[PDB]
């Protein structure tokens, strides 16, 4: 029931992901180093990791079928509002139940359990879905092309692009994901997108607080300041 166009969409998103997610971390050596022992000793390293990852999320987004047909303005609004959520999603691939990060490390970048507890709970629940890589990359793409992001102009078009991806995901689940694993799986994936909105909001609140201090803002990168705010 998966059409030729749906198979094509999935192949494009798998490759896009492979081209932008290096599971060897060969690039992490170029970040400011993690420091472990208001210290914020992990802020330089994690700011560089996040800045790097925003670059990768952008590379992935550019390859989402249809994303190129949006105006540069709408592409901007969609990336700024989704970047932290796609970083959280894509990090599920390194999450497990110098470059392994624990709760203390995130604390040492200026964040609190108000963010970190729900974030770990999200990563556990996502891991339990045991998604196929096809599903994982469709979910990141659906997250990016969300018509309800504030500031979207041509929402109809964004919606149309997202529907094509949502329909692909739903058909993929029916055709390629065997029960019991597949039971309510689409609704569960959409619930994760809802969970990400709440995480986005709490991250934004803590980010505004930590970056309000110029000494911490100094430790971020130019891209992080531009995307997450300054």
């Amino acid at each position: 029931k998966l059409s030729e166009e749906q198979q094509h969409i999935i192949a494009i998103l798998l490759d896009a992901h492979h081209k932008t997610y290096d599971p060897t971390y060969a690039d992490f050596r170029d970040f400011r180093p993690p420091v472990r022992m208001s210290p914020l000793s992990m802020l330089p390293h994690l700011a560089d990791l996040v800045s790097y990852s925003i670059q990768k999320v952008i590379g992935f987004a550019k390859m989402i079928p249809g994303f190129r047909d949006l105006t540069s303005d709408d592409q901007i609004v969609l990336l700024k509002s989704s970047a932290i959520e796609v970083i959280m999603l894509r990090s599920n691939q390194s999450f497990t139940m110098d470059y392994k990060y624990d709760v203390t490390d995130v604390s040492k970048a200026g964040h609190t359990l108000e963010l970190i507890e729900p974030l770990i709970k999200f990563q556990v629940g996502l891991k339990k879905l045991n998604l196929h890589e096809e599903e994982h990359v469709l979910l990141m793409a659906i997250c990016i092309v969300s018509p309800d992001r504030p500031g979207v102009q041509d929402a109809k078009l964004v919606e149309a692009i997202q529907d094509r991806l949502s329909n692909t995901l739903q058909t993929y689940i029916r055709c390629r994901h065997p029960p019991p694993g597949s039971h309510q799986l689409y609704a569960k994936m959409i619930q994760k997108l809802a969970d990400l909105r709440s995480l986005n909001e709490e991250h934004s609140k803590q980010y505004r607080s930590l970056s309000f201090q110029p000494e911490n803002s100094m430790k971020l990168t130019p891209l992080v300041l531009e995307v997450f705010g300054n």
């Binding site: 670059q55 952008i58 590379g59 987004a61 550019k62 540069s72 592409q75 901007i76 990336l79 700024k80 130019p222 891209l223 531009e226 995307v227 300054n230």
Partner: peptide, 11 residues
């Protein structure tokens, strides 16, 4: 605000 870096990466 402007987003010159994001604009440049989006090509």
């Amino acid at each position: 605000k402007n987003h010159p870096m994001l604009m440049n990466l989006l090509k």
